[PDB]
A paper describes a structure:
We collected cryo-EM data from the mixture of the [name] complex and mALYREF2 in the presence of the cap analog m7GpppG. The data yielded two maps that correspond to the [name] complex and the [name]-mALYREF2 complex, respectively. The [name] map was refined to an overall resolution of 3.38 Å. The electron density of the cap analog is clearly visible bound to [name]. Compared to unliganded [name], the cap analog induces significant rearrangements in both the N-terminal extension and the C-terminal tail of [name] to form critical interactions. For example, the N-terminal extension (residues 16–28) swings toward the central globular domain of [name] and positions the Y20 residue to sandwich the cap analog with Y43 of [name]. These conformational changes were also observed in the crystal structures of ligand-bound [name]. Overall, the cryo-EM structure of the [name] determined here resembles the previously reported crystal structures of the liganded [name], with root mean squared deviation (RMSD) of 0.81 Å and 0.71 Å for [name] and [name], respectively.
Residue numbers in the entry:
A (entry chain A): 27 to 41, 45 to 527, 539 to 790
B (entry chain B): 5 to 149
Write the structure that this text describes.
Amino acid sequence: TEDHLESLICKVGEKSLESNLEGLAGVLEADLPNYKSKILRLLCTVARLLPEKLTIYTTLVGLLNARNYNFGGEFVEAMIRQLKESLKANNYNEAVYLVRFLSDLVNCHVIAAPSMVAMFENFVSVTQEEDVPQVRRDWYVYAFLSSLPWVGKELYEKKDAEMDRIFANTESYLKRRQKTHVPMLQVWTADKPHPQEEYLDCLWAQIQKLKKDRWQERHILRPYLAFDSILCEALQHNLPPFTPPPHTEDSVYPMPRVIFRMFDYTDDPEGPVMPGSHSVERFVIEENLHCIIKSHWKERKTCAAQLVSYPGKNKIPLNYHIVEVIFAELFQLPAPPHIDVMYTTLLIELCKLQPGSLPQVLAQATEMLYMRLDTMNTTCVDRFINWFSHHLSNFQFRWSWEDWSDCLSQDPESPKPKFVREVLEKCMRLSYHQRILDIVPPTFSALCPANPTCIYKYGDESSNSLPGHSVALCLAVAFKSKATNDEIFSILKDVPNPFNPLKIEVFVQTLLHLAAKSFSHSFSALAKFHEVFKTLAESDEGKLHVLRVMFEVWRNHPQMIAVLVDKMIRTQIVDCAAVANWIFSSELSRDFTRLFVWEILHSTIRKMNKHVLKIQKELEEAKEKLARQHKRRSDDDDRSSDRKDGVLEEQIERLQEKVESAQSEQKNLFLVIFQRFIMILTEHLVRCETDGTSVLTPWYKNCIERLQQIFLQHHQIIQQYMVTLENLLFTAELDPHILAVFQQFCALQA
Amino acid sequence: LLKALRSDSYVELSQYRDQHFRGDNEEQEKLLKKSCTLYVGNLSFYTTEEQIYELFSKSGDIKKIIMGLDKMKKTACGFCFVEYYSRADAENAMRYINGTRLDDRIIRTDWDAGFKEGRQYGRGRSGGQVRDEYRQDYDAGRGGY
Ligand SMILES: C[n+]1cn([C@@H]2O[C@H](COP(=O)(O)OP(=O)(O)O)[C@@H](O)[C@H]2O)c2nc(N)[nH]c(=O)c21
């Protein structure tokens, strides 16, 4: 039954629970003497791996501790070692799960209450440390506060005098916390419907309400209440004087967050009265549901079934909470906890799992998001754009568009009309141009996407006066005759020279127009004539000129240029630096606010980041080969491996210098983007000041938030460039509006 | 780790095997596990290379898409092969995009041993997919019977 023990441990939570707990203690006792070490490992792992039902497992420990006092002895000691090493590994996400598990144990009388108070004193005392990042101080305070709901009433009455000083110290710290990072993190800057506040501020207020009403909560479930008689005689265990690990340079702390509300109890009048925003029982609901998503993110069917059957579903309206939680996971703008596409399909299975009510609230939830689009962070809008279009894709594109009739009588660059324009454009990607026109009411015909057809400058009937037209027709027959690369050069030799920009334009326009049928034809054309592009576009400005003429060919088909540039980079036709310059070129200025251009920039960045990691990975494995051979050389004294080591020694140095070459290339890419980002924004700021116009414009609002978004999606990489950015680009002389973005980013993690 | 949490009944290979493959069963077993190409099923005949690229780009970047053409008609038979750069990226598409409606049509995905020349043509007697001949019901997406 070695494999049986872990199975039955996981079975207790699923689906007479108290009777199930009682039986579980008996079977655990039978094989405890010979499997004690293995049992401790299983309980320790499930304490951090399964925080969704930690109250269930705490009662299991209490019953085992009650029957065997010695069992609870080493288990607590083993639990501390797990916590002690977890902090050393900078794995704080489950560290809070562990400290919650310890806190709930005092309810099961496993842990002495005074010892737990001294444990929290050290956590709060971290704020008294100096020269330590403010983020680290936040986590320890968060860990203590987060565990309070499970330990609120019982711990308070025992040692109120001590923890009141603890509460004062925590309250004192929250007053002087830096709040510079909130504006980046809040999805909505507006406060009228529901304010967005930092998690500590929201959590603290909920604790105050819980403290106000004598620490009573209704949502949480406490199985140990039923086993009151048994746990009374159990002897408590005193915790060792734990101390937090000292701060180290390599230590990494979790980023600050912000919890957003999109629902109010007035939204569902007939249903159960859901907890208010500053209600502690609401926090535990979202926290459990987040862990449900975290635990079963791989299995969408299993995840959907688990959260819908959430314990205590009768008290609280599940449909409104689950929808809010999914959007909460989706709009964590630093990074969603999983792949973005997971949430789109998760709601699909949820929708079909509860067809009775969930489609109604989800439709209502979508409308609520639409009305708040006036002040929503753009990086979250793109996630909203992708989900809503995809959700419409697998629902026959059925929607009451006439409801959003207000978008027509607005500025075309206002967020609401822009949202409609982007959604239809994305819906165009999944269907036909005619298909979108049919479903949309005719009044929105102005917002319908344009027909994605190639634009040929050298058209048959356009004009014969355009330069190079005679040469252009020669390219057409050459391509249709499957000409070789060398003879293509001969045709280009006749092009007059005003490097030659004219040669690029005539070659690109003809080649793209010929391969305008599909992506496969276009990909083949570039591969077929790979050498031609490399020879012609040798200069950096020549590489840039390839993109601008390419954009003119497919201005009306954003998806076509979405992948066309991607293939060019991987074929070394144009480096990432050229693409970044092309984005901010005056040619794209009119469409700079479009969503598709930013997908280009991020895809280019990801390719550079992915490529440099692969080179680093290749260096590491080659480095380990030296370690592997040296270990074998020590074991087997072979003198013929000296030449073998020499082969890899000259190999690794080539990789090492290549990494520096690659890292410098990656560093240059971000430097170019930020350098190019400053000049455009500064130009906007000075002209608005000179002309007296308001700075807050739809163009400026969209552009400034893109600067935040690129910071957020690659903060880990940008961490290596703090010295360079501060000394060169982001300086004190810079405008405060631009510098404020860097002000919050550096304080975001440090 | 934990036995229950590590379970994911979407990445594991299906019972399908390519009988045209040169090698025994175990060769696919090891090759399928370390593979970055997956096969889709029962696409609409009117679907296009752009649509499938857009849908699967959500999981991650694509290296190459091979449309499933007819043996003789040289026309799409409602299936295609999609190849990702990294295995981890391809798993997400299999975990989530699989079973999701596309062009008002439910699609089905499965791992593949890797693209080979001449493998994109339908192996059915008529020229399309073998399942087409055994199909009996009426559907416009698959050109009728
Ligand atoms: C059902 N199915 C068909 N194909 C591919 O589709 C083409 C023709 O498949 P088929 O001969 O119609 O499949 P069958 O023998 O199971 O009836 C070939 O290129 C096959 O590799 C398939 N390819 C993969 N990877 N997985 C599948 O389940 C699958």
